[PDB]
Amino acid sequence: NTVTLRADGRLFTGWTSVSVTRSIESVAGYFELGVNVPPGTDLSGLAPGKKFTLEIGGQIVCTGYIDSRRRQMTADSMKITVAGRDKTADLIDCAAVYSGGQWKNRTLEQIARDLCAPYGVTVRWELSDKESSAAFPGFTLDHSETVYEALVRASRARGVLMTSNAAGELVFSRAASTATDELVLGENLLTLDFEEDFRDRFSEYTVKSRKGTATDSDVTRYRPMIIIADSKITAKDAQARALREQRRRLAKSITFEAEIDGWTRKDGQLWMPNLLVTIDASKYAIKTTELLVSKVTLILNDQDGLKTRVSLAPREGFLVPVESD
Amino acid sequence: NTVTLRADGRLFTGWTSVSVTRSIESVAGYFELGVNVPPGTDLSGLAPGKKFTLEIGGQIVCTGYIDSRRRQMTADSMKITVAGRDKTADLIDCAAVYSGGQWKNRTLEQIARDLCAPYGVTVRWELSDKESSAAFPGFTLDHSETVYEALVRASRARGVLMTSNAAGELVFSRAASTATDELVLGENLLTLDFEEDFRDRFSEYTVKSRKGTATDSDVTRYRPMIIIADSKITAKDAQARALREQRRRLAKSITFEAEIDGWTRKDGQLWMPNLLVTIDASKYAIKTTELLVSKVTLILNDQDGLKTRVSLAPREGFLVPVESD
Amino acid sequence: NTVTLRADGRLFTGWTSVSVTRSIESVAGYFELGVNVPPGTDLSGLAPGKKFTLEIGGQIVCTGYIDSRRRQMTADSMKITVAGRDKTADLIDCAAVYSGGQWKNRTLEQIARDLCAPYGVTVRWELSDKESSAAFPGFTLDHSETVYEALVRASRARGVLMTSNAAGELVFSRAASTATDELVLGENLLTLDFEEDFRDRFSEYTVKSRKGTATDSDVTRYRPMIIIADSKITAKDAQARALREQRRRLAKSITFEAEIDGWTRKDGQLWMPNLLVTIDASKYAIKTTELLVSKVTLILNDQDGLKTRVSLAPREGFLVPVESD
C-alpha cells in the first residue's frame, strides 16, 4: 500500500525508495527510505535521533529512532536517504546496566524487564510453558556486555528466541510451530533460489576431559568437528553446545531465498519473520515441508517494483538448546 | 595542470589515469598513475623501489619510493600502472629500532628524530606550545612495534596529530584552527554528499575500580558504552580515553564527501588535508561551520575529468586528548 | 574438450558454465558447473554428499564429494549450479583423529596415512630424498586441530609441500624444478597481467633473547620486520621462520596472471599447478625465468569462451624451510 514515516510529529510520504528488513537473527528491524526532493524542502523532522513510526497502508511495521540522514546534492537536485531501527536497537548497541549488578530468583522475563527499563523498551513474553519461565537462582552481568549479550546468555539458558516487533518491543518466543502460508511458484512466488550447501555441515560435533556430542544424519560420510570447551562443563552443557552447533549449520546449509509479489500474505497481513510456511515448486520437483521464515525484506523501487524478499530455512535450525550459565 | 613523475632521474608525463591521496588518518600519502604504452617503451625507471617525486604543474605533491608496477598486456597493447607512497611509508611498515632501547628526558620531536633516522625521514615540528614540547622523563620501545605505532603512543601522550607532507617528512601539528577556504555548491563544489550517522554515537562513554567518562550532548537518548581498561589507570587517562572514543565517533558520524572542480584551491595551492573550511549549500538549507578536511584525492580520468574528492568532518573529531604511557 | 560429471553412478554433460580450480596453497581442488534445465529434469544425482568424478575429454581432473546444489527458478525456467571438491576437502574441514594420540619413530608419510585413513583418503609420497623421509622421534596431535593443520606442522618439519590431485589423493612433494612449458604472448598466451608489488616486502626479517634472520636482496632500502617468537626457539627454527616469511612475501609480491587459450598444455595434458614454466612477452621487453604455477582455473562461459587462468610466481617463493615441532 502506501509508505508513511511519522517523525518529529510530522508525516512524510512519497518515498521512491523503500527497504524494510526484519529477521530472527536480530533484536531489531531496520528501514531505509529514499526520494529526490525539490530545493527548499524542510527535512528537520528526518534528523538522526528523531523518534519515528513507519506505517504501510496503515499498520505500523517499525518504531524506534532515526539512525541516519543522508543528503546527496548537485547544483540541480538532492537525493535524501533516511534510515532507522526498532527501539530495541539500543539493547544491541548499549551496555547492560543494572542498579544492583545481579538478580536472585528472577525469571528471564524479569531480568529482561530490568535491563530494558533504562532504554524504555517494553518486554513481550509470548511463552506459556514452565521451563522457559523458571526463575534463575542467580544471574549476574558480565563487565560491560551489552543488554543484548546478557540476554542472549539468559535466553539461551531457557531455550527461547529473542526478537523484536513493530512497536519496538523485545519479544521472547520459540520458532513458530504451525504453518500458516504457502508459497506457490508462478503465483505469489515470483522467483525461488534454493541452496543446499554442505561445506560447513559435519557428521558429528564434539565439545571437549568432559564431553558431549551431537550428530547430523544428513551427512553421509565421516566428518567430525571438535569444539574445545571449559573443563568444568556439564555433560549437559556439552551436549547442548554440540547441538547448537549442528543446528546453526543446518540453518545456513539448507536455504531458500524467495521473491514474493507485493508485501502482504494471503490473510492481508504484511510478511514477517518467524512464520512457518510451505513452498511448492512442483514444476521443478520441489515441494517442501515446514520452512521457517528467518528474514523478510519489504522493498519498493523503480526497477524492482513492489516485492518482498523472504529467506527461509528448516525450522529445526532455529530451536534454542538449553545451555547453563 | 600537468602531471609529472620524476623517477630514476628520468621524467614521465602523459598519464591517462591519476589518483593521489593524502589524509590525516595516515602518515603517508599514496599515488597511482596509469597509461597505455606503445610496444618498445622503456619502463625501467618505474620499477618498485625507485625513488620518485610526483609533481603537478610544478609543485611537488608527494615524494617517496615506488611501491608497485603493473603491466597488463594483450598481443595488441599494454596498460601500465605505477603506485607509490611518501618516504614516511617505511615508518608505517617497519619496526621501531633504536640503538639503545629507550630515551630519558627527550621530547616527542626528539624521540621521532631517532626513530626516523635509520629510515632517512626528516621530522617536521609545527607546534609552538609548552605542553606538546614537554620532555618525557622516560620513553621505551615496545617489542617489535612499528615506528608509527611507537610514535602514536608518544604523540597521543602530547595531544598532537602526526601526518606527512610532500617532500615526505613526518609532521607534528594539531587540527588547523583558521578557516581558509569556502566550498560553494554550484561553483567550485560540484557535488556534496552529507551524511549524519548516529548508529555508533553514544550518550556517554565510560572507561572501566578506576573510572572516567565523556558524554556526547548530541545524543538525545540514554545510550551508554563501557570500555574495560587496566586497573592501574589514572582518573586522567580514563577521562582521556573516554574522550578519544567520543571524538573518533564524532569524526565518523558527521561527514561530507565533496566533489571539487579542478585540483587547486582559490589561492592556487593544491587541495590538502588538515584545512579548515566552510561549506555553503544554502540552496538546500545547508550552511556549515568549521569542517576539517580529513582527506583529499586528486583524480584525473577520461570519464571523471579533472576533479578532487574532499572528505570533511567536524574539527573537534580530530583533537587528540592527552593519554599517558 | 567435453565436460562430464559422473555422479550417483550417472553421467551429466552439457554444462553451459564450468570453472575448475586447483592451487598449491590448498589441499583440495574445487569445481562448479552451471546450466539451465527444462522442467522435469531429474537432478537427484547432483545432491550434496554424492560421490563424483569430473572428467574432461576423458581424463579425470577432480574426484571427491558434491558440496552444494543450487536451483534458481522462475515460472519459466531454472538454473542449476553444482559445486564440489577433492576427497581431500575432508582433511581441510575435519578434526585430526588418531586412535592413539601420537606416533613414535614414524615418518611424515606414515603419520599422514594414519590421519587420512578414517577419511578414506590415500597418501601419495612423491619424494625420494633422505631428509623428507626421516622419521619423527615423536609426533603428537594438538587438541581438535584439523588433519590439514596437523600435517602442515609435520610437513613443514620436513620442508615439503602438500597438495592434492585428480583421483583426490594427498600428495607430498616439492616445487617442480624442471621447466616443461612456455607461454608466448600472442600465441597460447592471450593476456598477461604482471604485477610487481613491494608494499609487503622487507629488507630483513628477524624473529625474536633467541634470534635468527633472513634478508631480501631485492629490497634496496632499510626495511626491517620483527617477528616475536617463543623464548625457547632454536637458532635454527628462528632462521627458518624468518626465511618462511621472506618467501611468502616473495610469492605474493612478484606475480603473473595469465589467460591461456584452451585447457591443455602443448603436450596435450590439462593445465595444473606446480609446473615450472617460462613466459615470453618480448614484445613488451618481458622474458622471464622459471615461474611456478601456483594456481589454475579452467573455465567455460558464453562470454569467456574456453580459457584457462594461470597464476604464477617465483619458484623460490614456494620452497618450504624446515621448522621443528
Q: Are C146 and C167 in contact (CB under 8 A)?
A: no
Q: Where are the alpha helices (DSSP H) in B129-259?
A: 130-133, 147-156, 235-253
**Nearest CA to CA, how far is B201 from chain A (Å)?**
9
Of C95, C34, C31, C37, nearest in space to C63 by CA: C31
Q: Between chain A and chain C, how many beta carbons pairs sit less than 8 Å apart?
A: 79
The shortest CB-CB distance from A72 to any of B193, B225, B226 is to B193
**Nearest CA to CA, how far is C142 from chain A (Å)?**
11
- Report residue B308: phi and psi, to 5°: -130, 135
DSSP structural state of residue A221: S
Strands C276-281 and C179-184: parallel
* Contacts A43 to B, Cβ<8 Å: 285
Q: Which residues contact A301 (CB under 8 A, 6 or more apart)?
A: A17, A18
Tell if the CB–CB gap between B197 and A67 is shorter than 8 Å.
Answer: yes
Q: Are B201 and B255 in contact (CB under 8 A)?
A: no
Q: Which residues contact A34 (CB under 8 A, 6 or more apart)?
A: A15, A16, A17, A18, A79, A80, A81, A82
Tell if the CB–CB gap between C68 and A196 is shorter than 8 Å.
Answer: yes
All cell numbers assigned to C169: 589423493
Tell if the CB–CB gap between C75 and A285 is shorter than 8 Å.
Answer: no
- Report residue B319: phi and psi, to 5°: -85, 130
Q: Which residues contact B303 (CB under 8 A, 6 or more apart)?
A: none
Q: In what order do the strands lie in the sheet containing C161-164?
A: C123-125, C170-173, C161-164
* Contacts A250 to C, Cβ<8 Å: none
Tell if the CB–CB gap between B94 and C223 is shorter than 8 Å.
Answer: yes
The rounded distance, in Å, linking the Cα atoms of A107 and A132 is: 8
Cα distances (Å, whole numbers) of residue A319 to A233, A240, A307, A310, C75 = 21, 11, 29, 19, 33
Distance of alpha carbon C31 from the chain centroid: 13
- Which subunits count as partners of chain A given 3+ CB pairs below 8 Å? B, C
Tell if the CB–CB gap between C221 and B75 is shorter than 8 Å.
Answer: no
Tell if the CB–CB gap between B224 and A39 is shorter than 8 Å.
Answer: no
Tell if the CB–CB gap between B221 and A49 is shorter than 8 Å.
Answer: yes
- Report residue C138: phi and psi, to 5°: -155, 150
The rounded distance, in Å, linking the Cα atoms of B279 and B289 is: 7
Half-sphere exposure of A303 (CA within 13 A, CB side): 0
Of B156, B148, B150, B162, nearest in space to B241 by CA: B156
**Nearest CA to CA, how far is B313 from chain C (Å)?**
29
DSSP secondary structure of C61-128:
EEEEEEEEEEEEEESS-EEEEEEEEETTHHHHHSBP--SSSEEEEE-HHHHHHHHHGGGT--EEE---
Q: Which residues contact C34 (CB under 8 A, 6 or more apart)?
A: C15, C16, C17, C18, C79, C80, C81, C82
The rounded distance, in Å, linking the Cα atoms of A111 and C113 is: 54
Tell if the CB–CB gap between A221 and C73 is shorter than 8 Å.
Answer: no
The rounded distance, in Å, linking the Cα atoms of C49 and B104 is: 66
Q: Which amino acid is at C101?
A: G
Contacts of residues C210-216 at CB distance under 8 Å and 24 or more positions apart, as own/partner, are C210/C234, C210/C235, C210/C238, C211/C235, C211/C238, C212/C236, C212/C237, C212/C238, C212/C239, C212/C240, C212/C241, C212/C242, C213/C238, C213/C239, C213/C242, C214/C239, C214/C242, C214/C243, C214/C245, C214/C246, C215/C246, C216/C246, C216/C249, C216/C250
The rounded distance, in Å, linking the Cα atoms of B142 and B144 is: 6
Tell if the CB–CB gap between B67 and C199 is shorter than 8 Å.
Answer: yes
Of C180, C235, C175, nearest in space to C210 by CA: C235
* Contacts C48 to A, Cβ<8 Å: 196-198
Cα distances (Å, whole numbers) of residue C92 to A223, B146, C121 = 11, 34, 12
Which residues of A touch chain B, with CB atoms under 8 Å apart?
A: 39-40, 42-43, 47-49, 65, 67-75, 78, 90, 93-95, 97, 118-120, 143-144
* Contacts B40 to C, Cβ<8 Å: 285
All cell numbers assigned to B131: 605542553
Domains and CATH numbers, chain B: 1-86+175-196+253-319 (2.30.300.10), 87-174 (3.55.50.10), 197-252 (3.30.1920.10)
- Which subunits count as partners of chain C given 3+ CB pairs below 8 Å? A, B
Instruction: Provide the strand spans (E) within B24-77.
Output: 30-37, 51-56, 59-74
The rounded distance, in Å, linking the Cα atoms of B211 and B235 is: 6
**Nearest CA to CA, how far is B214 from chain C (Å)?**
36
The rounded distance, in Å, linking the Cα atoms of A247 and A232 is: 24
* Contacts C65 to A, Cβ<8 Å: 221
Residue with cell 613526518: B170
Q: Which residue does chain C place closest to A217, by CA atoms?
A: C49
Burial of A210 (0-12, 13-18, 19+ CB in 10 A): middle
Cα distances (Å, whole numbers) of residue B185 to A75, A201, B257, B259, B277 = 6, 55, 13, 10, 14
**Nearest CA to CA, how far is C270 from chain B (Å)?**
23
All cell numbers assigned to C80: 542449476
Which residues of B touch chain C, with CB atoms under 8 Å apart?
A: 39-40, 42-43, 47-49, 65, 67-75, 78, 90, 93-95, 97, 118-120, 143-144
> Which of C71, C77, C86, C116 is the best substitution to test chain A (most A C-beta atoms within 10 A)?
C71
Q: Measure the CA angle with vertex B315, ends B281 and B286; round to 5°.
A: 15
Tell if the CB–CB gap between B223 and A94 is shorter than 8 Å.
Answer: yes
Burial of B6 (0-12, 13-18, 19+ CB in 10 A): middle
Q: Between chain B and chain C, how many beta carbons pairs sit less than 8 Å apart?
A: 79
- Report residue A314: phi and psi, to 5°: -50, 130
Strands B224-227 and B204-207: parallel
Question: Experimental technique used?
Answer: X-ray
Would you give the end-to-end CA distance of chain C in angstroms? 46
The rounded distance, in Å, linking the Cα atoms of C195 and C215 is: 22
Burial of A51 (0-12, 13-18, 19+ CB in 10 A): middle
Of A277, A265, A283, A281, nearest in space to A311 by CA: A277
**Nearest CA to CA, how far is A75 from chain B (Å)?**
5
Q: Given CA atoms C147, C150, C154, C159 in this order, what sign does their dihedral have?
A: positive
- Neighbouring CB atoms inside 10 A of A303's CB total 4
Cα distances (Å, whole numbers) of residue C205 to C7, C219, C232, C253 = 49, 12, 19, 15
Cα distances (Å, whole numbers) of residue A239 to A160, A181, A220, A232, C188 = 17, 34, 21, 14, 57
Of A147, B120, A11, A77, nearest in space to A2 by CA: A11
Stretch (H or E) spanning C223 = none
Strands A276-281 and A179-184: parallel
The rounded distance, in Å, linking the Cα atoms of B46 and C285 is: 14
Q: Which residue does chain C place closest to B71, by CA atoms?
A: C194
The rounded distance, in Å, linking the Cα atoms of B83 and B33 is: 6
- Report residue C123: phi and psi, to 5°: -90, 135
* Contacts B205 to A, Cβ<8 Å: none
Of A309, A314, A271, nearest in space to A290 by CA: A314
The rounded distance, in Å, linking the Cα atoms of B19 and B216 is: 37
Q: Are A314 and A198 in contact (CB under 8 A)?
A: no
Q: Which residue does chain B place closest to C285, by CA atoms?
A: B40
* Contacts C78 to A, Cβ<8 Å: 284
The rounded distance, in Å, linking the Cα atoms of C165 and C122 is: 11
* Contacts A42 to B, Cβ<8 Å: 285
Q: Given CA atoms B37, B41, B46, B52 in this order, what sign does their dihedral have?
A: negative
Stretch (H or E) spanning B142 = none
Q: Are A95 and A133 in contact (CB under 8 A)?
A: no
The rounded distance, in Å, linking the Cα atoms of B41 and B82 is: 14
Tell if the CB–CB gap between B226 and A118 is shorter than 8 Å.
Answer: no
- Report residue C176: phi and psi, to 5°: -45, 145
Tell if the CB–CB gap between A194 and C73 is shorter than 8 Å.
Answer: yes
Tell if the CB–CB gap between C192 and B118 is shorter than 8 Å.
Answer: no
All cell numbers assigned to C303: 562470454
DSSP bridge partners of B178: none
Q: Which amino acid is at C109?
A: E
Tell if the CB–CB gap between C198 and B67 is shorter than 8 Å.
Answer: yes
- Report residue B203: phi and psi, to 5°: -70, -35
Q: Which residue does chain B place closest to A89, by CA atoms?
A: B199
**Nearest CA to CA, how far is C121 from chain A (Å)?**
12
**Nearest CA to CA, how far is C101 from chain B (Å)?**
36
Q: Which amino acid is at C108?
A: L
* Contacts C227 to B, Cβ<8 Å: 144
